[PDB]
From a paper:
The E571 residue is located within this NES-binding pocket in a position close to the bound NES, where chemical and physical changes associated with mutations at this site (most often E571K or E571G) alter how XPO1 binds select NESs on these cargos. Glutamate 571 is located in the XPO1 NES-binding groove, and the E571K mutation changes both the shape and electrostatics of this exposed region. The considerable change in size and charge resulting from this amino acid change may also affect SINE molecule binding within this groove. The covalent binding site of all SINE compounds, C528, resides in the XPO1 NES-binding groove within proximity of the E571 locus, the latter of which potentially contributing to the biochemical environment uniquely conducive for SINE binding. Lastly, crystal structures of XPO1 (wt or E571K) bound to several SINE molecules (KPT-185, KPT-330/Selinexor, and KPT-8602/Eltanexor) show the compounds binding similarly in each case, which was further confirmed by a similar cytotoxicity profile from this class of compounds in patients’ cells with or without an XPO1 mutation. Comparison of wildtype and E571K XPO1 with all three sets of KPT compounds gave pairwise Cα r.m.s.d. values less than 0.18 Å and XPO1 side chains were in similar conformations, implying that both wt and E571K-XPO1 will confer similar XPO1-drug interactions. In all structures, there was no density for the side chain of Glu571 in wildtype XPO1 or for the lysine side chain of E571K XPO1, suggesting they are flexible and mobile in the crystal structure and unlikely to make any persistent contacts with the SINE compounds bound in this groove. Furthermore, while the variable side chains of the SINE compounds are likely flexible (weak to no density), the trifluoromethyl phenyl triazole scaffolds are well-defined and bind similarly to both wildtype and E571K XPO1. All structural observations suggest the E571K mutation is unlikely to change how KPT-185, KPT-330 (Selinexor) or KPT-8602 bind to XPO1, and will have little to no effect on inhibition efficacy. However, by solving crystal structures of SINE-bound XPO1, we determined the E571K mutation is unlikely to impact the inhibitory potential of this class of drugs.
Author numbering:
A (entry chain C): -1 to 376, 414 to 446, 450 to 456, 458 to 977, 981 to 1052
B (entry chain A): 9 to 187, 190 to 216
C (entry chain B): 78 to 200
The structure:
């Protein structure tokens, strides 16, 4: 409607209309809310709206209106303060100060408009950051004096001081120059004596809760930086650990203050200070025991009930106890009069560790790791904690989370999907339980065997109980002696089988199956020494591969390969009492074993066989095993190759396409585990495989021509491209592991390039496989140095056409993007001569492509782009004083300098700062080391490149950042060039520049910080 | 029974995609930066009745920040979002938290690490600790795979209603109606287009 | 919940899409269990589908005999069909749906069940 009128500034501002626009935004909805929002944004962003700020704060009926007005002032103070004439600066100051005093003295405004007062306090702090103490030396003394005139003013002054400390000490690193932060830190440090005096007196005499809470909230911030003497040479620790722990209004903030007190490393030679550190802990634990909860209390229940602030308090208690004890528990471990305090604090932690809260459990678990690792090494300590550790063993065992390997889940015992939050937690639990087992292996075995005895009984049978126990049992593998482990493992399995027999129903069955599979897969040392059992296990895994339950099936395959990775040797030798190596038995029945598996599980099976086969180091025997393993896919391959040459229409059948893809996938799986040993099988299919690659390629092109680009979405063409992708993956997989690189070059490479390069170049973009680039990257990486002409061929076939795919936006063809710059990186690193052979027009596109990578926010591309630029510079520098290097610098030195400066300063590429700074330092150092032997300019004759570089950069920055003074730019560049050998200082100067360009009037002496 | 929820975090962390997933069920693949704020109502059905969130989805890009902390006034809860594939977005979490709690001193806040579906994770689980001292709840999430996508709202609803046993429940499913040959000759225009527009993510499990 | 007066004839996990005719894009509407429910009183069969964790309805409409399942150019495990009266979001809207399944066999079984339900509703 008529809301836009406030945007017209030739008017007088209709405060009533502004308040209606504001009310419509905050309390409205729908389209009218959306319209008011856009209007308010335009109002706030108007460069003169701040001149309306006083009138809004005087005449408005809406607190949100005043808030927005203060945001307009904040934006002015933060960015354009020093452009104002001095009278406007004094006017804004007096006006903000006056409004704060005004709101404080009206008791009903003080109670009802907390946000608006908080926003005003922050606004005042922004003025202090610009004006204090140089142009406001009396702020702190007057603040202290005014604190006695009113309790409201005293409380609000604590808020101002809290915000001031935060802005100076907690959030200055990214927001101020190094010099300005140092100046404000020194200013606050110089005046803190008086500040602490006011703070301690307020805490000591104690007014009412609100003033105390605000004073403690300010103290929490001071503790981040103030000298230790203020805490230990006063009586404040006794106030914090007694008086302020008793009242729940101050308990939360005081516990956080004491946590910060605890996270200092005291001068640990002073007996007096050690006594005080003990004392405030003793006091605090006494207050909790008497005023909150005794150590026997059920904190799990309390947390779950979530009354009032109980969850936050228990979180804060855990942080306090873990912080203090990780630093200071040694202070409590020798004095016998402190033993009760030490163990009571850990007993609270035991109770806190039973809470059902994932993130809190991780906090306590981090502490337990800290403790048990120390008990594992430090002499004479573990006996102190014997009872704590015993309880902890029980807590961990009962709260084990599901490991990666266990693929069966309750929803209904089903088969997941999925993640790593749980994976990291399992690993952290295992770490602590392993330590705990070493600390007392008898106690651990007794807890686990007793728990397992009660699953037999049915005393405590449940899916949850057999799962966590089985997972804990598997997780401690390697902690016991081989003999105890033997007895331990035997008992566990026999009993787990006692649960299967006594369980009925498949739901129950797939649970105990996953548990047995996890345990056995975790104890390969046992399996290696007991062949007859290992054989029985594998046979049973094979049975599981025929299971109707889908989860059991997948885990059997994963367990099979997990065991084989560790016990492979026992499958390759002929065992006693056996007629042949077990690998021969496995290969023979591979068709019957894998009949009910999905294809990708079949391929895992073949990969597991490849692991075993590679343990045979006799070449003739290994190649024969390899030949036997591939019998089924090779037979299918020969059949499908014979009925593909004649009648090239046969691949129209989608069922044929699936068969081919599965054949290649099987070869990929075996090549993954066999690596260099796979060569004889690759050679068996290589030439016909590349002919198939060409044939499928013609089919794809034919479909796109007959059906349009939409053909690439159809199941048929997607299946054909899977063939090409798996062929490329197979060749990439082998070459990445090949040991005979002569064979790679003479046998594999040239037929490969003939089959893939022109086909990629001459397909429409939507039909090009990014996997071609990935395969070529590996080819260049491994044998690039031996095929200089082949690398040139690669560039000619993929460079310009892929670049044209990805240089219109940052989003299309994301995989081509990533592989493209991976390929350029390796060519530039390993076959730089291929770029020297490029025509000048194409080399310019290469420079264009590198800078294009700079501007990506995708880290995959950005990082490689910055790395290529750095390597390219080094490649050029390595050439020395030759025509190509001279021409490169004349054509491209300043392009790289300015492009790097652009992404450094544009606020859209912060993730690359470190590598951008490295590149810029290298470029600058090239000039100030006189490594560029020709003039960079086209300015008088004889001028050094150092002089021209400074003039170029000064002009560049003057035009790009016209609000900077000439002295700012000159001082920045002088410091930056001085520092081009010291990356850390260099980067600090760049950071200072990024601060200064966001405001007006930055001090040029800031760049002398170093 | 409605509550104001402000959603903040660096640009590109997935704030808008996360809300859209809860609004319509879709996954928006494109990045269209939010300008200032977008307000959407969002209702969940629980065993304690319906709960309505007025979700203020704010802009993460500084040049599009609009009213910035002006959007936080009278928020009753919040979600702080970052991207586990971008360390800078986690490094900025304390800055978003600072500005938020200066306006909203005592509200429940969830910290969400989004995009855990991406293989090359960069902000490791072990390094995510900022929530501990600040009493924020934390979740790994993925708007793309829906991993834990319901957990932030479920936790906030339990805190705002004050019932730890609150659960999402199935809404009542009314009987659907029994229901044009005037345009039936033209609902092959609209249908053939749909038939010949391929479905997205055909390689997914569903 | 409004589901006790009904019998479950068929259940399958699926991902449901809706066609944005303006933007020319398919948009996901929900993933979860798709159920064919036969009303005990009227014998009419409807599709009812809820999202996995929020349990929110993403499909609720009669399996009309007028409807026809069509293939999508990009999938061998999906069906496209027009719907004139779906009340998952509120007031009965018309939609062009696509529903995709875990496998071609699930899509084929769904089509068989979808057509057996159309017969039931033609009484
Ligand atoms: N792989 C993946 N991508 C996601 C996920 N969530 C969002 N994205 C993607 O991240 C990009 C950013 O989208 P968006 O939701 O607008 O983020 P935003 O924080 O709201 N942007 P802004 O704050 O500037 O308005 C999109 O391309 C989106 O597809 C996710 O969970 N996984
Ligand atoms: C219980 C689960 C089960 O039987 O699943 C079937 C498929 C329904 N159960 C019974 N027997 C085992 C068992 C026996 C083994 O003998 C050594 C080995 C295993 C294995 F897990 F190690 F493979 C399992 N499990
Ligand atoms: Mg957004």
């Amino acid at each position: 409607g008529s809301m836009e009128g406030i945007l017209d500034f030739s008017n007088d501002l209709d405060i009533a209309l502004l308040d209606q626009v504001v009310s419509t935004f905050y309390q409205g909805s729908g389209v009218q809310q959306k319209q008011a929002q856009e209007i308010l944004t335009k109002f706030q962003d108007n460069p003169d709206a701040w001149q309306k700020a006083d009138q809004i704060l005087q005449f408005s009926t809406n607190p949100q209106s005043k808030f927005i007005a203060l945001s307009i002032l904040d934006k002015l103070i933060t960015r354009k303060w020093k452009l104002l004439p001095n009278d406007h600066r004094i006017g804004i100051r007096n006006f903000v100060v006056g409004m704060i005093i005004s709101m404080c003295q009206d008791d009903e405004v003080f109670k009802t408009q907390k946000n608006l007062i908080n926003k005003s306090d922050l606004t005042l702090v922004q003025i202090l950051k610009q004006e204090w103490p140089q142009n406001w030396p009396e702020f702190i003394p007057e603040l202290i004096g005014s604190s006695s005139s009113s309790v409201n003013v005293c409380e609000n002054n604590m808020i101002v001081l809290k915000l001031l400390s935060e802005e100076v000490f907690d959030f200055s690193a990214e927001q101020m120059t190094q010099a300005k932060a140092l100046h404000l830190k020194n200013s606050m440090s110089k005046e803190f004596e008086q500040i602490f005096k006011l703070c301690f007196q307020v805490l000591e005499q104690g007014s009412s809760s609100s003033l105390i809470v605000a004073t403690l909230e300010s103290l929490l911030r001071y503790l981040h930086w103030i000298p230790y003497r203020y805490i230990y040479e006063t009586n404040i620790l006794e106030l914090l650990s007694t008086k302020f722990m008793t009242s729940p209004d101050t308990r939360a903030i005081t516990l956080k203050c004491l946590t910060e007190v605890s996270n200092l490393k005291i001068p640990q030679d002073n007996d007096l200070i050690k006594r005080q550190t003990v004392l405030f802990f003793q006091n605090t634990l006494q207050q909790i025991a008497t005023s909150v909860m005794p150590v026997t209390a059920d904190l799990k229940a309390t947390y779950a009930n979530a009354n009032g602030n109980d969850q936050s308090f228990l979180q804060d208690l855990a942080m306090f106890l873990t912080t203090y004890l990780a630093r200071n528990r040694a202070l409590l471990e020798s004095d016998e009069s402190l033993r009760e305090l030490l163990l009571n604090a850990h007993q609270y932690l035991i109770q806190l560790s039973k809470i059902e809260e994932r993130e809190l459990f991780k906090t306590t678990l981090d502490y337990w790791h800290n403790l048990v690792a120390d008990l594992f090494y430090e002499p004479l300590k573990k006996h102190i904690y014997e009872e704590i550790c015993s309880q902890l063993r029980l807590v961990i065992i009962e709260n084990m989370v599901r490991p990666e390997e266990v693929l069966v889940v309750e929803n209904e015992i089903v088969r997941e999907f999925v993640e790593s939050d749980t994976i990291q937690l399992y690993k952290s639990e295992r770490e602590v339980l392993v330590y705990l087992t070493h600390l007392n292996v008898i106690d651990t075995e007794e807890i686990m065997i007793s728990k397992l005895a009660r699953q037999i009984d049915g005393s405590e049978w449940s899916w949850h109980n057999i799962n966590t126990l089985s997972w804990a049992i598997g997780s401690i593998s390697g902690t016991m002696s081989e003999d105890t482990e033997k007895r331990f493992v035997v008992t566990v399995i026999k009993d787990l089988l006692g649960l299967c027999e006594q369980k009925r129903g498949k739901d129950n069955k797939a649970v105990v199956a996953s548990d047995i599979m996890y345990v056995v897969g975790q104890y390969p040392r046992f399996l290696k020494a007991h062949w007859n059992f290992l054989r029985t296990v594998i046979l049973k895994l094979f049975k599981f591969m025929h299971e109707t339950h889908e989860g059991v099936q997948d885990m059997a395959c994963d367990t099979f390969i997990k065991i084989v990775q560790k016990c492979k040797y026992h499958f390759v030798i002929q065992q006693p009492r056996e007629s042949e190596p077990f690998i021969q038995t496995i290969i023979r029945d591979i068709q019957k074993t894998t009949a009910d598996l999905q294809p990708q599980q079949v391929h895992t099976f073949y990969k597991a066989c490849g692991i075993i086969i590679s343990e045979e180091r006799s070449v003739a025997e290994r190649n024969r095993l390899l030949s036997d393993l591939m019998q089924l896919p090779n037979m299918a391959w020969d059949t499908i190759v014979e009925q593909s040459t004649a009648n090239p229409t046969l691949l129209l059948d989608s069922e044929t396409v699936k068969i081919i893809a599965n054949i290649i996938k099987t070869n990929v799986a075996v090549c993954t585990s066999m690596g260099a040993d796979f060569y004889p099988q690759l050679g068996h299919i290589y030439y016909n495989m590349l002919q198939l690659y060409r044939a499928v390629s013609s089919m794809i092109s034919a479909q796109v021509a007959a059906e349009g680009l939409i053909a690439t979405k159809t199941p048929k063409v997607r299946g054909l491209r899977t063939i090409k992708k798996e062929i490329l993956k197979l060749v990439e997989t082998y070459i990445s592991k090949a040991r005979n690189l002569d064979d790679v070059v003479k046998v594999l490479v040239e037929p490969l390039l003939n089959a893939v390069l022109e086909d990629y170049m001459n397909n429409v973009p939507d039909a090009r496989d990014a996997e071609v680039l990935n395969c070529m990257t590996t080819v260049v990486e491994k044998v690039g140095h031996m095929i200089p002409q082949g690398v040139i061929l690669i560039l000619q076939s993929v460079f310009e056409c892929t670049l044209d795919m990805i240089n219109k936006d940052f989003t299309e063809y994301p995989e081509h993007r990533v592989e493209f710059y991976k390929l350029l990186k390796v060519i530039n690193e390993k076959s730089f001569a291929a770029f020297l052979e490029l025509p000048p027009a194409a080399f310019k596109l290469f420079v264009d492509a590198i800078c294009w990578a700079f501007k990506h926010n995708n880290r995959d591309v950005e990082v490689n782009g910055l790395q290529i630029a750095l390597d390219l510079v080094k490649n050029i520098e390595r050439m020395g004083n030759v025509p190509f290097a001279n021409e490169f610098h004349k054509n491209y030195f300043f392009i790289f300098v300015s492009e790097t400066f652009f992404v450094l300063t544009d606020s859209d590429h912060k993730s690359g700062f470190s590598k951008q700074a490295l590149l810029l330092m290298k470029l600058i150092s090239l000039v100030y080391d006189n490594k560029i032997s020709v003039p960079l300019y086209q300015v008088p004759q004889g001028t050094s490149n150092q002089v021209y570089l400074s003039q170029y950069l000064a002009n560049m920055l003057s035009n790009a950042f016209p609000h900077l003074t000439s002295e700012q730019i000159a001082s920045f560049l002088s410091a930056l060039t001085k520092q081009c050998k010291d990356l850390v200082v260099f980067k600090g100067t760049l950071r200072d520049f990024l601060v200064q360009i966001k405001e007006v009037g930055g001090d040029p002496t800031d760049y002398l910080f170093a | 029974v409605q509550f104001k929820l402000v959603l903040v975090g660096d640009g590109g962390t997935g704030k808008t995609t996360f809300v859209k997933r809860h609004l319509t069920g879709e996954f928006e693949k494109k990045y269209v930066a939010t300008l200032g704020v977008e307000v959407h109502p969002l209702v969940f059905h629980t065993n304690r009745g319906p709960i309505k969130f007025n979700v203020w989805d704010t802009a993460g890009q500084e040049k599009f920040g609009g009213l910035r902390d002006g959007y936080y006034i009278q928020a009753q809860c919040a979600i702080i979002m970052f991207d586990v594939t971008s360390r800078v977005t986690y490094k900025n979490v304390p800055n978003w938290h600072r500005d938020l709690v200066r306006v909203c001193e005592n509200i429940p806040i969830v910290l969400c690490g989004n995009k855990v579906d991406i293989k090359d994770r960069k902000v490791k689980a072990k390094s995510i600790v900022f929530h501990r001292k600040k009493n924020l709840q934390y979740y790994d999430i993925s708007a793309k795979s829906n991993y834990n996508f319901e957990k932030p709202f479920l936790w906030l609803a339990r805190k705002l209603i004050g019932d730890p046993n609150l659960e999402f429940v199935a809404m009542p499913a009314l009987a659907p109606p029994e229901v044009d040959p005037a345009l039936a000759a033209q609902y092959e225009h609209d249908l053939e287009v749909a038939q010949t527009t391929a479905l997205p993510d055909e390689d997914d499990d569903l | 919940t409004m589901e006790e007066d009904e019998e479950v004839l068929y259940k399958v996990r699926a991902k449901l899409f809706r066609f944005d005719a303006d933007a020319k894009e398919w948009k996901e509407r929900g993933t979860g269990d798709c159920k064919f429910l036969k009303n005990k009183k009227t014998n009419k069969v409807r599709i009812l589908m809820r999202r996995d964790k929020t349990l929110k309805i993403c499909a609720n409409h009669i399996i009309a005999p007028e409807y026809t399942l069509k293939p999508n150019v990009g999938s061998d495990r999906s069906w496209v069909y027009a719907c004139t009266a779906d009340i998952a979001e509120g007031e009965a809207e018309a939609f062009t749906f696509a529903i995709r399944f875990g496998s071609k066999e699930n899509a084929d079984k769904f089509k068989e069940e979808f057509e057996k339900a159309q017969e039931i509703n033609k009484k």
